[PDB]
Symmetry: C2
């Protein structure tokens, strides 16, 4: 039982990181309309609090977070990412957020040290 708890603590759980990214997106962006001047601030925020919440977990993971914000104008959006690592320890999480005005896709990567 203790080994299972240790593995869970040391593993990159997708659900908690997804909740972290969702909360970061909600806090930084919210229901605000699209503004080209605010893309830098929103992306930098989302990244910063996503990293802060990932680090507050205490897991020995090198956290990589990327954020893309794009206005909705009928343009198709596709985000694909393939990587190679040790699938036993490292994990990834893809979260896509959208509203009436812009798209938002944030990817958080947790890699064991």
């Amino acid at each position: 039982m203790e080994d299972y708890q240790a593995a869970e603590e040391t593993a990159f759980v997708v659900d908690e990181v997804s909740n972290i990214v969702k909360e970061a997106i909600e806090s930084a962006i919210g229901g605000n309309a699209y503004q080209h001047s605010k893309v830098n601030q929103w992306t930098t925020n989302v990244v910063e609090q996503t990293l802060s919440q990932l680090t507050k977990l205490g897991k020995p993971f090198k956290y990589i977070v990327t954020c893309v914000i794009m206005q909705k104008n009928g343009a198709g959006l596709h985000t694909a990412s393939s990587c190679f690592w040790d699938s036993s320890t490292d994990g990834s999480c893809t979260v896509r957020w959208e509203n009436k005005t812009m798209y938002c896709i944030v990817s958080a990567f947790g890699l064991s040290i």
Copy 2:
């Protein structure tokens, strides 16, 4: 002299990663225009060529490659990458590639095993 050569071999060189990304995009996308249904194939080909060349490098790092493809129809573009690793041996490279009607942004991360 030998130590410097070994360090260069075990260092994540940004220039060669950028060259690999450019070659992968050119061989996978090239002069072809944007097509919404074909974005999946272009992103997949770019990322797999990048990963294959990066593995053929043989450096002892774990790699993350994300390829993103856009339409040039007034959609705002901005990519920011702030993460948490050990900066002494791990690095990242962001390469922006564009043509008359198409955007393709690819980011590569390499982290020490």
